[PDB]
Design a protein around this ligand. Structure first.
Ligand SMILES: *[C@@H]1O[C@H](CO)[C@@H](O[C@@H]2O[C@H](CO)[C@@H](O)[C@H](O)[C@H]2NC(C)=O)[C@H](O)[C@H]1NC(C)=O
Lengths: 49, 50
């Protein structure tokens, strides 16, 4: 339950939904936002493991 | 009320904004694939497990 609930966290970014950032923001900043989200989710998965 | 939500906070049901009705949404099927095989020296036939 903690692992599944971990998704909604912003991880310092402005939103947790990919489509909004992609269709509302330019790719150059989408790079760093996606990097933040990927780093957070990898950390969560490694902790669970 | 327009659209429902589950425990994990994901949409499940939606009311049609045109006709007054309720529908429920489930993601279509997905899974993993496994390959069952004997040794290569024995044969080259395999089986699939979805
Ligand atoms: C709003 O949606 C309703 C459906 O609930 C439409 O009413 C339907 O109209 C058709 C023919 O135009 C009938 O065969 C249906 O029986 C009607 N529905 C019901 C529940 O009786 C209505 O036309 C829509 N409004 C607009 C402006 O398009």
């Amino acid at each position: 339950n903690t692992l599944v609930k971990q998704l909604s966290s912003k991880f310092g970014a402005i939103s947790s939904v990919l489509n909004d950032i992609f269709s509302r923001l330019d790719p150059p900043e989408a790079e760093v936002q996606i990097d933040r989200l990927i780093t957070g989710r990898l950390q969560s998965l490694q902790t669970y493991v | 009320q327009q659209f429902g939500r589950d425990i994990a906070d994901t949409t499940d049901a939606v009311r049609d904004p045109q006709t007054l009705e309720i529908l429920d949404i489930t993601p279509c099927s997905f899974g993993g694939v496994s390959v069952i095989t004997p040794g290569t020296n024995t044969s080259n036939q395999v089986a699939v497990l979805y």
